[PDB]
């Protein structure tokens, strides 16, 4: 769940669909180290997600 430290408003929550606009706001919160998931079907399909 990445919050913006400077004000602490909930910009984006855990386990959500990925969109262009929030990526910009996110890296501007000063957080330049994020954690994608590996769900490629076949060997590791989207089960738990």
């Amino acid at each position: 769940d990445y919050i913006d430290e400077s004000t602490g408003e909930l910009i984006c929550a855990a386990n959500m669909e990925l969109s262009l606009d929030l990526l910009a706001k996110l890296s501007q919160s000063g957080h330049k180290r994020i954690e994608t998931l590996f769900t490629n079907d076949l060997d590791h399909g989207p089960y738990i997600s």
Binding site: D41, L42, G45, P46
Partner: protein
């Protein structure tokens, strides 16, 4: 190589709509037509087709 068309059992969640077929064309890449009609011949291979 022998191609085997997998049934729903080993298919993922996305591969459910794709209905398999061997489509019959010409040397130029044009669709050859079924007898007396304008159908593009699409012989849809059912389950477990070696």
């Amino acid at each position: 190589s022998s191609l085997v068309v997998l049934d729903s059992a080993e298919r993922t969640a996305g591969g459910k709509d794709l209905r398999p077929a061997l489509k019959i064309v010409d040397a130029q890449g044009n669709d050859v037509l079924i007898p007396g009609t304008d159908m593009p011949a699409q012989y849809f291979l059912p389950g477990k087709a070696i």
